[PDB]
């Protein structure tokens, strides 16, 4: 039991590592989506022309 609990805590820390990497990756994706939202709101401007839209 003692030895198994030691190895199990090692596995639990491995799981925390995986979750932490993935969760940190999703933050930059959120950031870029916010930027695209601003660009889309800026497209709704009756003074833009086709070059500005491009």
């Amino acid at each position: 039991q003692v030895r198994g609990l030691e190895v199990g805590m090692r596995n639990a820390n491995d799981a925390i590592s995986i979750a932490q990497i993935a969760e940190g990756a999703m933050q930059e994706q959120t950031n870029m989506l916010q930027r695209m939202r601003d660009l889309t709101v800026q497209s709704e401007n009756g003074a833009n022309s086709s070059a500005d839209l491009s």
Partner: protein, 54 residues
């Protein structure tokens, strides 16, 4: 981007039609430089996000 690819290397001003033609080609050159600068700016923004994620 140089005076040969921008078509501004042989402009005249001695006749009415020559002035009209020169005006159109200068405006077109300004447009193409704007497009190139737009793409380089997009690349720089992308590289900033990528370095942050790394």
């Amino acid at each position: 981007s140089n005076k040969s690819s921008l078509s501004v290397g042989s402009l005249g001003n001695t006749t009415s039609a020559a002035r009209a033609s020169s005006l159109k080609k200068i405006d077109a050159a300004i447009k193409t430089i704007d497009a190139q600068r737009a793409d380089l700016g997009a690349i720089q923004n992308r590289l900033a996000h990528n370095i942050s994620n790394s």
